[PDB]
Amino acid sequence: APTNLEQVLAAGGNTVEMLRNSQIGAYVYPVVAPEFSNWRTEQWAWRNSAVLFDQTHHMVDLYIRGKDALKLLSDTMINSPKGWEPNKAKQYVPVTPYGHVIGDGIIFYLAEEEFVYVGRAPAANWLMYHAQTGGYNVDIVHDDRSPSRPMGKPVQRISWRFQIQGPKAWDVIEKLHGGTLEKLKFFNMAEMNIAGMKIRTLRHGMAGAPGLEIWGPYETQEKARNAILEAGKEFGLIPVGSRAYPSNTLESGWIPSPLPAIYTGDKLKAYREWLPANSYEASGAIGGSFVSSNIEDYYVNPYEIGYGPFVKFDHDFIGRDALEAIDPATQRKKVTLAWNGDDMAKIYASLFDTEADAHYKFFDLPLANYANTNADAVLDAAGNVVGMSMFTGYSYNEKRALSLATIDHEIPVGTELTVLWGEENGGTRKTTVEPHKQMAVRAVVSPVPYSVTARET
Amino acid sequence: APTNLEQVLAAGGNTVEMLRNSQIGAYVYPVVAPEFSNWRTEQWAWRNSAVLFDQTHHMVDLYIRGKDALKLLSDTMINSPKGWEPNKAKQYVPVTPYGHVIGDGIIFYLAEEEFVYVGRAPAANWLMYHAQTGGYNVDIVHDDRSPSRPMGKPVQRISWRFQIQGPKAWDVIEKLHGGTLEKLKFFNMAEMNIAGMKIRTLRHGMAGAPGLEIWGPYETQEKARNAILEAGKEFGLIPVGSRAYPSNTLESGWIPSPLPAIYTGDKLKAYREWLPANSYEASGAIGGSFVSSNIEDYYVNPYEIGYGPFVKFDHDFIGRDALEAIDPATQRKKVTLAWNGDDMAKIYASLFDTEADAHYKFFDLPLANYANTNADAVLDAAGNVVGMSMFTGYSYNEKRALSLATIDHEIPVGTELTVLWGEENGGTRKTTVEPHKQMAVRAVVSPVPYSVTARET
């Protein structure tokens, strides 16, 4: 019966309990081969040689054209539109009227009245809703991320999208280009030669080395891919697969999985009526140890996950008044949490105990998430919840399990907290969860981007 | 330049060293989604509820038709042809003139002059060679296993092939059939109803519960798959993905990966000239701690991996004389090795040591192989090599790492040996291998099929 999220929520009991027991399964990074060599060597190459990241399949793309396109984005983003011109990209972040993050993505200003959104579903959904119901003179082409389990079916995108990253990436880029390529400022766009094609570029980088994101029409994917791989052998470039790939952001610091904060509030009811019953927001899952019967406890505002610096009060936008009323000095702060290696060893050891009644929650390598939204409790020494850990995995470059979290602003760097790993009462009904008991994992507050930190007494 | 395996070996230095450093990458079980729920729950269901195994993609299929088809198989198999009639299947095992296993697979006698081979490449290759060069009046249609990394390309087979297994499999099978279905003897063939289709069946089973293998033309895959899943929800049937699937044989006892023993011997030279330079035999890899500069040390004969009982001296076949000269009472015997849980814990712990110069070889879950052929050394207490461990992984049903091995026939059950886990000198150049140090893993000799065994002093 339910045709939209509002009807789903009305019929579905407690919103938290429904999302924490969803049958959606794992959040999949599809189509790209899980591994080309092995995920450990693949993680190693983006820090030590060079890599081809295949981003063609795991992101929703929105092609946005028309007279009101720039107004649609300015009206919905916390980011400043002042001065924005073609061949500059921005990390679009929209908030609700209540000041809460909906999602985020990359918006390329491609030409006059021509933009492309690239990112997870939630902010794509928000943009389409306003384009359709807010009377904007704009046309949108929605190109979904690829199916999670194609089972041999053919897969199409409108565009291929790659990154070339690593200490030797610029050497590869210039070999392909045929000569020196100017390094623009971060997120500025230009072009380059690849095998006789003019390929548009986005200045990017990782861990102190310059890189590029590149894209083109789907039909030229192979021509570009093979040229990239051939030219990069000299420099040790290797392709990264979908198993190692999503773990990159544990080193970089971007949290991909804020819960879209749209489940409550009278001002968001018309959006809940617009969202389909099988949307990301209605069908996805929440996993982790953090428990509240109030879904609002899972929301974040832009200051709390590091988008503070993007907030510019120089234009009209949804939620501006809620953002102006916040004091940025008191908000939770994004950090990296370095997980105690002895606790990790204990977690894995329990998989090999033939006598014990329960084991600790399976921690997959190199990504350990088991929902599309992650929410593990971060506790102080007395047991008070002092933060939310939101993306969890392992880095072969550090030999450490890491997670990205938002924590009370007064917790100094170097403090030893605990992350509660696993779910209660033996686990929710998520099809990603096996029966297990919880552990309080020691974790050390560290900077973002991550860097090794001492442990205060 | 090289167009065949002979030219590859002549040009490629030491045969062992070439195979132990191959750049082929991992041996992949393709197309089927890695997981549908999670591999732990998927392993659990084939022992506790019911499962749909998707076998459509990881095996080479040979369709063999014509007057000499049955003679081709009798001439090349150790198995008896006496009495063989349509609607009976056999586990075809061919040996070389020197008595050594080439490979194995399942041969279905489908009708008069109509057979299908289903299995890994090596025995498929052996059959095609004799069909082409031995003057058999026979026609063969070769249908390769699916590509390891299709990257969104469409994938076709001639047939889909499923198994339904688990304690409740027969309940699912009879629900689909619409009434009682007679349980034939193992490997006898008949038919059943699925959604209005007559589906051919192969009597099968697992761990004491009856099951079926089923197959049909590729175009009806979805119709059968969805009918199987719908009817099985009542009984808790779930689909198994490609991550959990190949680990099943650690509980059942079949060793899938004997090295095709074709690299030496004057009688095999014409076969080496026939095998392509990019064949399985020329391009694949050997991984594990067992080191010999003689490739013959990697061969096995049928007695050593449990095909002894299939050997019937009632027909003429390649290698018969070599097999008659063997004494079965002195050959190595297949066993299961139960790996010490403390040693497993030590292996995983080392991934989280930020101080140590090297860690132990990464043991993936639930399958840990890193080549298409596996060869780890099994040692006694003095350090003598007393066996070869050939398939390695983990069972969530046992909470144990296990491997299948062949060991000297006098080692009694319950004896504690060691498996040397990892490769020497920091590892071969296989793209599956990260830098690592070796460990001698304690392993307890156990029956095949596996069952928990006490440890003798």
Ligand SMILES: COc1cc(C(=O)O)cc(O)c1O
């Ligand atoms: C930019 O593409 C990414 C997406 C996710 C995600 O959507 O979860 C995680 C990552 O580390 C990525 O690099």
Ligand SMILES: COc1cc(C(=O)O)cc(O)c1O
């Ligand atoms: C029968 O299909 C299988 C093939 C392999 C293999 O080819 O390695 C391993 C298995 O456990 C299987 O069940």
